[PDB]
């Protein structure tokens, strides 16, 4: 199956309260494996998964040096962007960066990403061609023209097409038993009377991996998407995820509604009925 | 591995 690696960067300015706070996390598929915080104590890249601890101290020294380098880069970018937008010198602002590569079942480069943001809005983004940039506002074109003259697209493509996929494949083999496994959902249904005339049927999905899951109610085959309460897929804290779905029912029509669980860990889609 | 090209923004 198609696997992924993606790093997330967050740099928040603290005007007068210190230096910008840099938080960095790395996610192979849906499993975090590295972490760095500038306001921490270790001041080092730290593992967050068992299959990455097997890497040598050299890995944990080069990753610490390289991830710290982006903290310095975003520090100056924070003031550069403040001037572009003419914001106050005492206000806090956030720069967010997402980049990563995608391999296929074979292990070959499928596609790569690079997206930057400012204050929760898009700023600049590397296109799919890995050769051109897309700016969102007129101040991001300042960055684009600078980055187009520095051939940043070439340099970023050299990582996404090279070092990225190389180490993603390495990470996948280091944790075969944890990354290339699928945990099917543990499904059950519950029934809560709202009154003596109505009730709430909830369809549950517990401890499943990965995150992608589709839960749908049907009334004699007709979808009930309009009359349904859906919650965001949420983590359990142990690497698996949770999701439950509710529908309000008449008193004596609980056996007309069916829940359908779709997940790649299930060889055949489940059908739950009360 | 980390490979974000920083070029000034």
């Amino acid at each position, epitope marked *: 199956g198609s696997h992924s690696m993606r790093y997330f960067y967050t740099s928040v300015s603290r005007p007068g309260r210190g230096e910008p706070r840099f938080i960095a996390v790395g996610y192979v598929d849906d499993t975090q494996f590295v972490r760095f915080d500038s306001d921490a104590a270790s001041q080092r890249m730290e593992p967050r998964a068992p299959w990455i601890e097997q890497e040598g101290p050299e890995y944990w020294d*080069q990753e610490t040096r*390289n991830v710290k*380098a982006q903290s*310095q*880069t975003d520090r100056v970018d924070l003031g550069t962007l403040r001037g572009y937008y003419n914001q106050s010198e005492d206000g806090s602002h956030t720069i967010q960066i997402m980049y990563g590569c995608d391999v296929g079942p074979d292990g070959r480069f499928l596609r790569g990403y690079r997206q930057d943001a400012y204050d929760g809005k898009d700023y600049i983004a590397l296109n799919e061609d890995l050769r051109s940039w897309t700016a969102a506002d007129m101040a991001a074109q300042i960055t684009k023209r600078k980055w187009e003259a520095a051939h940043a697209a*070439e*340099q970023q493509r050299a990582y996404l097409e090279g*070092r990225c996929v190389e180490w993603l494949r390495r990470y996948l083999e280091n944790g075969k038993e944890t990354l290339q496994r699928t945990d099917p959902p543990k499904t059950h249904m519950t029934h809560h009377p709202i009154s003596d005339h109505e009730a709430t049927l909830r369809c549950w999905a517990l401890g499943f991996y990965p995150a992608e899951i589709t839960l749908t109610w049907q009334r004699d085959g007709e979808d009930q998407t309009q009359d349904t309460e859906l919650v965001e897929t949420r983590p359990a804290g142990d690497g698996t995820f949770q999701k439950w779905a509710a529908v309000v029912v008449p008193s004596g029509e609980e056996q007309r509604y069916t829940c359908h669980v779709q997940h790649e860990g299930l060889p055949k889609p489940l059908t739950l009925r009360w | 591995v980390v490979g974000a090209v920083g*070029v000034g923004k």
Partner: antibody, heavy 109, light 113 residues
Framework: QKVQQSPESLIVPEGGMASLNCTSS?????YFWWYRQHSGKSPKMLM???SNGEKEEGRFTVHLNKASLHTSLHIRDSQPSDSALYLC??????????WGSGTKLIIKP | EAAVTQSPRNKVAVTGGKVTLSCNQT?????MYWYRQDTGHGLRLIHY???????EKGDIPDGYKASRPSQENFSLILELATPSQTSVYFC???????????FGPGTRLTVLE
């Protein structure tokens, strides 16, 4: 010395072709460079390559085979303004550059 | 528009003296490096910096000191000069790989006894 350049000295006639080679011993190298230093001057980038294949810009042609970690500079139509030290570079497992000894081009007028 | 300057440009010193070589970039580059070129070794990294205030060691950092007081200035301090520190010293600036490392004019230091 991880980066090995050959030849050490090259006397090429004016108008001829000069092929310089460089090979790395560090397998974790994703980018290669070629820098030109005229006598008593500073190094300045000439070519860059990170993908397998060839890249032509003017009289200069650069080649790369990441399997053998081999880069090759081919200066055609040699002019006396190319007599310089040619340095090969390679991106580390870090993001620093590993520099080579250098090759001396002498273009006899 | 690359502007990497170096000062001093030529200097004679005595064994035991202090030689502080300075470099100045105006290209908003967070990475600055201090190289040294001798015959048979090419360019060899002494010290380098990833940003203002930071100073990291390179491959030949013994006998040399460094200081990055600002993003624009990077210094190489030879506290106790030795005759083995006679070389041509180059300072470079760049941006974390980084299409090009922009080199300075280079300083000719000859340490005599």
């Amino acid at each position: 010395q991880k980066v090995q350049q050959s030849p050490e000295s090259l006397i090429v006639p004016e108008g001829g072709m000069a092929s310089l080679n460089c090979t790395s011993s560090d397998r974790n190298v994703d980018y290669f460079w070629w820098y030109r230093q005229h006598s008593g001057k500073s190094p300045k980038m000439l070519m860059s390559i990170f993908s397998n294949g060839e890249k032509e810009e003017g009289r200069f042609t650069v080649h790369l085979n990441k399997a053998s970690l081999h880069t090759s500079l081919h200066i055609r139509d040699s002019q006396p303004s190319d007599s310089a030290l040619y340095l090969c570079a390679a991106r580390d497992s870090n993001y620093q550059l590993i520099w080579g000894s250098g090759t001396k081009l002498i273009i006899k007028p | 528009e690359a502007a990497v300057t170096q000062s001093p440009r030529n200097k004679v010193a005595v064994t035991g003296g202090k030689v502080t070589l300075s470099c100045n970039q105006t290209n908003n580059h967070n990475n600055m490096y201090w190289y040294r070129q001798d015959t048979g070794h090419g360019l060899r990294l002494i010290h380098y910096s990833y940003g203002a205030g930071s100073t990291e060691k390179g491959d030949i950092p013994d006998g040399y000191k460094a200081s990055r007081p600002s993003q624009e200035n990077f210094s190489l301090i030879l506290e106790l000069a030795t005759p083995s520190q006679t070389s041509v010293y180059f300072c470079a600036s760049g941006d974390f790989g980084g299409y090009e490392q922009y080199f300075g004019p280079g300083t000719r230091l000859t340490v005599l006894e």
